[PDB]
Amino acid sequence: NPIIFIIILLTIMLGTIIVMISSHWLLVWIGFEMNMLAIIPIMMKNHNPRATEASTKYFLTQSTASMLLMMAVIINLMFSGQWTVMKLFNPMASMLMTMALAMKLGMAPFHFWVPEVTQGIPLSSGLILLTWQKLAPMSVLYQIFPSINLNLILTLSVLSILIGGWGGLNQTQLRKIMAYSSIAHMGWMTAVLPYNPTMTLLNLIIYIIMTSTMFTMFMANSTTTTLSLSHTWNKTPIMTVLILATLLSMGGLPPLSGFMPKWMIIQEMTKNNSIILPTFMAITALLNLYFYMRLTYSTTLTMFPSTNNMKMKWQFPLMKKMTFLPTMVVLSTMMLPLTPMLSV
Amino acid sequence: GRATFQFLPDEARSLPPPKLTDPRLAFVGFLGYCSGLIDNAIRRRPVLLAGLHRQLLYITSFVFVGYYLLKRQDYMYAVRDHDMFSYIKSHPEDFPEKDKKTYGEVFEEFHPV
Amino acid sequence: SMVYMNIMMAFTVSLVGLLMYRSHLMSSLLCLEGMMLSLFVMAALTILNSHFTLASMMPIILLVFAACEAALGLSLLVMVSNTYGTDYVQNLNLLQ
Amino acid sequence: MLKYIIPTIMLMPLTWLSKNNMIWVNSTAHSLLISFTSLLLMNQFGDNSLNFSLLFFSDSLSTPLLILTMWLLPLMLMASQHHLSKENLTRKKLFITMLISLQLFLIMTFTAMELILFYILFEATLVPTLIIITRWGNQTERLNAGLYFLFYTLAGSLPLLVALIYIQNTVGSLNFLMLQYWVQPVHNSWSNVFMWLACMMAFMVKMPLYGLHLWLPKAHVEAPIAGSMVLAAVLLKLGGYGMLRITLILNPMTDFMAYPFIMLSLWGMIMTSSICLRQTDLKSLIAYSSVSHMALVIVAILIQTPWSYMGATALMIAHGLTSSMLFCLANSNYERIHSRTMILARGLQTLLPLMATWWLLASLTNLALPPTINLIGELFVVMSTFSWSNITIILMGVNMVITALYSLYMLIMTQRGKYTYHINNISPSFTRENALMSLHILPLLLLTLNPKIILGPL
Amino acid sequence: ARQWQPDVEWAEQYGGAVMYPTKETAHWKPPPWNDVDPPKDTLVSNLTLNFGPQ
Amino acid sequence: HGSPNWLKVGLTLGTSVFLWIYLIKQHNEDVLEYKRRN
Amino acid sequence: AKTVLRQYWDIPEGTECHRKTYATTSIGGAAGLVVSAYSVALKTPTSFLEGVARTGRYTFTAAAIGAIFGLTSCISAQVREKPDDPLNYLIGGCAGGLILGARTRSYGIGAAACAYMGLTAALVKMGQLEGWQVFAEP
Amino acid sequence: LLDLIWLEAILPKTISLAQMKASTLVTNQKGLIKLYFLSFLITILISMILFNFHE
Amino acid sequence: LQYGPLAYILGEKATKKMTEKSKLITVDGNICSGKSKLAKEIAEKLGLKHFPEAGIHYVDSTTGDGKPLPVQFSGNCSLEKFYDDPKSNDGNSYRLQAWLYASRLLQYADALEHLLSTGQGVVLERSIYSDFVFLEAMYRQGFIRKQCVDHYNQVKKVTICEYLPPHVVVYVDVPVPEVQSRIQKKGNPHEMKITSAYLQDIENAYKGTFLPEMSEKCEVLQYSAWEAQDAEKVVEDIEYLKYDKGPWLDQNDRNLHKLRMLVQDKLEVLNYTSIPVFLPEVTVGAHQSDQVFQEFTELPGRKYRAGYNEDVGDKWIWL
User: Fold this and answer.
1) How far apart are alpha carbons F10 and I135 in whole angstroms?
2) Membrane spanning segments where (chain C)?
3) Inter-chain CB proximity I8 and A2 less than 8 Å
4) Beta partners for residue E54, in sequence order
């Protein structure tokens, strides 16, 4: 059990390297095939009958989303027979390409892949491992990029934040509130991808950091929003101040560094005489903030710590790489004149 | 833009290098100076002047890495302008010479309130 | 020729209404393994007349994962019947 | 600013670094010492112009406005100590540090050298204000008012970024206001309406029109310990001045559509002061005075051609000192009677004689008694918009009529007697209660001697 | 004491089933505080073969 | 008394002196590598 | 497709008030078939029949907006002063929206259907009037 | 009667407008794995008929 | 008891210490019958570290050094105050049972923590299962309400998932309710006149409620007499030692069983009983109110800073 838990966990990131290290559509088929093979055990570990009825709702959604990709390869096998990863030489192939791959990253259509899995997996511990599967197909859309129809990639992305926004105001379960606003932060980056496909990766590296540091804060006890009340005056009041800082940073407010992407990403979206496109989305992520305010109105205002239970003992979990996350996820807005010249 | 898959290529020798006592390198690690104080504050230390050996090596980390990171940032702008000026130098038909005309040529609006 | 239209009409054995529905989920996993041989054949007709001499190892490797893939998916479909006894896709508890 | 920001950040590791209850005396001591240094290099000359150092300062040359921003941290700590001293020292160290952290960004604001340095500092606030609104108030309707303070200010300010980045890659670069010598004019089109309108509307949401003032009697009504950010939120409202930096240039020739902003804010002026004479909450009485004769500047900026900028600048810091003190008059006299209902505080003027002068010399600045900084401000606005059309003396004259009957209604409610109740209300307005009520009129009538310091370019 | 209104009802109005804010609808469940195992029904009476007069 | 682990206490004090001397030698070389190239 | 707009935006321009509202009820008629309908239909499984009618039933309810939506314009385009203007085409907003106001009763929907539709009405023809382009390239 | 009504009617309508439509998108996503996939197929066909997507 | 992954791949802790010396044993008894007359007497010969029953100060009896802090900070319903059984109160008499259950659970979470660490048997006084026997006569005497009974009844299916049962569980020699003289003659001034409705009902509740664990595979050794007194002393010493390995387990249910191969019964109970803050982690209270188990937000929410002087006693610089 302990050693074989690494070898399963090691090959997840070995599956996604072959996706990136490839000049050949057959190897990118194998690449995130075996990821869909080596995630299914991590779903299981404590064997609860929601988890078995959740990974099977996870499974076949990423079997078909696999299967249409191999259909898209064999079409432009017939046309000119080159198999390098490049433009796909056929509009009937690229159309079938992009909205096949839109299930693994799930966009606004291909909807309930995101809440129905992440809710109620008893492994809420992590499930930070759902950042690799947002990272493998983005490494495929960097090459396919100069062959798309420019309407479909925006219509999946204009719907992305308009429906990833509305979906979670009606929630309490903070795994769903993390599952929502994970379609929204896939809406900002693929709205930009036809226009200068770098300054997309800037949004992604920020998104890995701010989301990974959100789950590590959650690993004391936290399950529900009512449980997010009862740890200010019990566990540590410094935790309440920290959990305020990242949310207000992840909303995009200019004293913090989640405003670092947008500020730069509109420098590219206009400069291309497209103005009505960002003004819709920039005003759309505003009610993506009413998750976070009304979440911060729970923990930071002493809202009813009742049912007197004392934690007179210390805490010994492993908060690994936590001391350096809200020091590059908040304070970096002055210190990045060019992060987009390292990553470029 | 050639010589692919390097962290920073060979041709970055003639760049200054970005020597120290620049305020970014003071600031890089100042946040690490703030970060080590947080590292005590999470765990009910209850010191806020705790073990210095944990409070050191954060300063050493960011400053070394941030220096070794900035050598390609100044490279990438240096390779940016280097390719623009060449395409400015060729094709003069895309870059005309504008005429110098003083304020004896323009009759502007004229809109007073 | 017409040997490609049939079979590209036969690729519509996905058809998504019958790719997860209705109940007896074994009927849906059936066409997931039967969606192969519409890819194993549609590749094999193209590599073989146009003498590529090397890409014909790819239809051999096309089975090897999709067998191991579906075998994994069939393991979990016992686990839905190990807890119940009936698969019945109108089982739903974890809402979305 | 060479280093005004650099000492005032050094105030911050002084508070937590200190001992026990010494934390009040240590902060207020050094914070007064900047007021020499703030005056020191500034107020120089003076004829086109003082570009100051670099890309960080144009020295706030023709609009000083910044000395008043530096009084307040040694004005609010002596005010906030009334009902704050029951919490922990670990949170008492917090509430001083975020207050300094609000003064830090205001110092690089008002000077700012640019227009895109302005915005990111124009929006760098509203995070430390919101912490003072939600925590540290009284009973509820804090939390919706914490959300009405957002979503007006933030919904409007995002179409600035669409237009300011649009200018930065259209005509050169906006980075300097002194690279604004080359300015192409902005004619009548169907896209140049929106360029004017989106660049303007985010300033209207802070200094309100008659519409969209719906957040202003929310944050000021339900308000911290003793006006503690309410003194800050009155500066912050007049710290949306940047329309003076923008609209003087940068679409200079659009008066064509000024008229739905004139008539809305000139008829609203005569009504939104009239709608307050039936108020029953005392802190909401002042909160509508701040609507009315702040909105007189909005018809003073859009009407150009100075003899208005003579007055529109003097009105920004007219009630910068007046409306601050009126909140301080109401942050006091609530520590003794625990209601803000204006009915209940009767039987007064016998019990507290020394503060009768503090009521009147407050309310004698709205009547405004011409040798002050007030009727040197209005009578330039009056003589300006007379020359727009003659008919505007009527509405602006009835503005002068109703606010005379309005200010005295707050005075005359204390001139009654027999008090009927109140075994409490003993405290005879202690040495602190008159000290922080002073330093308001002591500079307010002083500057009336030589008010050439308070003038635009002009 | 005095400071504000941190009342009880702000916990139950945020009380976690579905956060009904725009109507009461077909709510999900009161979801399990422990890990999620309500439906425990796994049993069968095993086969009753007679190897008799076979 | 004092009771640390006494094992790693000094590894942090020994890594920096390894890192800084590797940094400064890389810096004092590269300060001359400009003029050696330019 | 886009060629429907290439027969909408090309030929009439205010005049010929029958072919204007014959083509401008095709687009808005087609969106009644749309995903909204799809969703509700699937969601309720309807029945063997009657159910189907009811489902579509509301799609038929939806049809009607694009029938008047040229007609309110092309009448009022020529009768006043004979251009097409942003104040011309503004008129088709409110009463064009009031079809959704007429059914599913008003006093809380209908004027709000009137008001916001008048905002998004005039901006469309304003778009080509300034040459606005939503999905562009350098 | 006006300042708390017809300025407060139009903009806090928007609070009650979006939350009217933030309920039609969790309570109609109520499970139904049979009805995820019947709705993927409508999306896959409507991309064929609609617009630019094959062009 | 495991210490992370890295130590666990070198030497495991499932069975190289438990060489059949698991022998996790408890007692049930009644009042003044099985306290320490029989329980504490048997530590040797068999090497069984005795644990005490209960009390308000069990959390004070850990984390230190160590002296018990008073009943202000650990505000409970006060042993020898609830003997007034206040059927009409603010109150609350149920708020004892919350702290009664959480002081109960940490003994059993240190029980399994001690075994795989060392290998010793442990006698308990009353396990986590005894807490429902009180509730039978807590119910029928009028000093409890419903909608408080269901609460820990909902905790019982939440907090009890991984707990392997005890082994030769002894119902002690219990009289025919001679406890009415035992509660009087043995002192106990505050344990007082309250009649047979609390005496007889819990005695009827030892038989019909505790029977399924008594009918679970771990064989019991039951007595019902005056006392042991060299008649059930050695008989529950020798013939229970023969029932420790031989006449010991049927379905075997507790062995650190067949996943003792560095698998889910070997570490994943001995890593989830270490650091006992994750053990009362689902001991979080009601939805909001429950009308008894409450604490106000700032009074007594201001009774925490008095119990938070420096928040950690001693740690100094340079370490």
Assistant:
1) 59
2) 1-20, 28-48, 60-80
3) yes
4) none
Q: Which residue from D73, D103, D63 is spatially nearest to D244, judged by alpha carbons?
A: D63
**Interface mutation vs chain A, best among H36, H39, H55, most A CBs within 10 Å:** H36
Residue with tokens 């007595």: I223
Classify the phi-psi angles of I122: left when phi > 0, otherwise alpha if psi is within -120 to 50, otherwise beta.
beta
Is domain C2-84 classified as CATH 1.10.287.3510? yes
Residue in A338, D253, F36 with CA at minimum distance from that of residue B75: A338
DSSP per residue, D137-164? --SSSSTTHHHHSTTTHHHHHHHHHHHH
How far is residue I242's CA from residue C80's CA, in Å, rounded to a whole number? 44
Other C-beta atoms closer than 10 Å to the C-beta of D41 total: 14
Whole-number Å distance between alpha carbons of D36 and D54:
23
Q: How many other CB atoms are found less than 10 A from the CB of residue A296?
A: 21
Declared resolution, Å: 7.8
Spell out which residues of chain D touch residue E4, defining contact as CB-CB under 8 Å: 137-140, 142
How much of chain H is helix, strand and coil, in % rounded to 5? 50, 0, 50
Q: Do A91 and H47 touch (CB under 8 A)?
A: no
Facing residues of I48 across strands?
A: I121
Q: Do D142 and E4 touch (CB under 8 A)?
A: yes
Helices (H), A21-82: 25-31, 34-37, 52-59, 61-78
> Rounded to whole angstroms, what are the CA distances from A44 to B107, C69, I270?
78, 17, 20
Terminal alpha carbon distance of chain I: 28
Distances (CA, A) of I264 to A45, A123, C48, D332, E37: 10, 15, 52, 66, 18
Nearest to I131 by CA among I111, I160, I110: I160
Cα–Cα distance for residue pair E19/G8, rounded to 1 Å: 46
Beta bridge partners of I170: I27
Q: What burial class does residue A216 get, using C-beta atoms within 10 Å of its C-beta: 0-12 exposed, 13-18 middle, 19+ buried?
A: middle
H51: left (phi over 0), alpha (psi -120 to 50) or beta: beta
Is the CB of residue D389 less than 8 Å away from at least one CB of chain E?
no
Q: Give me the residue spans of the domains in chain C.
A: 2-84
Tokens of C94: 């974890």
Please state how this structure was obtained: cryo-EM
CA separation for the pair G35, A129 (Å, rounded): 33
Q: Is residue D148 a contact partner of residue D126, using CB atoms and an 8 Å limit?
A: no
Which chain A residues are closer than 8 Å to H19 by Cβ?
Answer: 169-170
Whether E8 contacts A304, CB under 8 Å: yes
Q: Which residue of B has its CA nearest to F4?
A: B51
Q: What is the 3-state secondary structure (H, E, C) of C32-54?
A: HHCCCCCCHHHHHHHHHHCCCCC
Chain C contact set for E44 (CB, 8 A) = 85
Q: Which residues lie below 8 Å from residue A40, measured CB to CB, with a gap of 6+?
A: A55, A58, A59, C72, C76
Structure tokens at B47: 């010191």
Q: Kindly identify which residue of chain A lies nearest to residue G138, measuring between CA atoms.
A: A272
Cβ contact (<8 Å) for G86 and D191? no
Q: Which residues of A touch D162 (CB under 8 A)?
A: 266, 270, 275, 278-279, 282
Q: Environment class of residue A212 by beta-carbon count within 10 Å: exposed (0-12), middle (13-18) or buried (19+)?
A: middle
Contact of H50 with chain G, judged by CB distance below 8 Å, is answered with yes
Mutant choice from A43, A47, A50 vs E, greatest count of E C-beta within 10 A: A50
D56 exposure class (CB count in 10 Å sphere: 0-12, 13-18, 19+): middle
Give the torsion sign (CA, G106, G107, G112, G115): positive
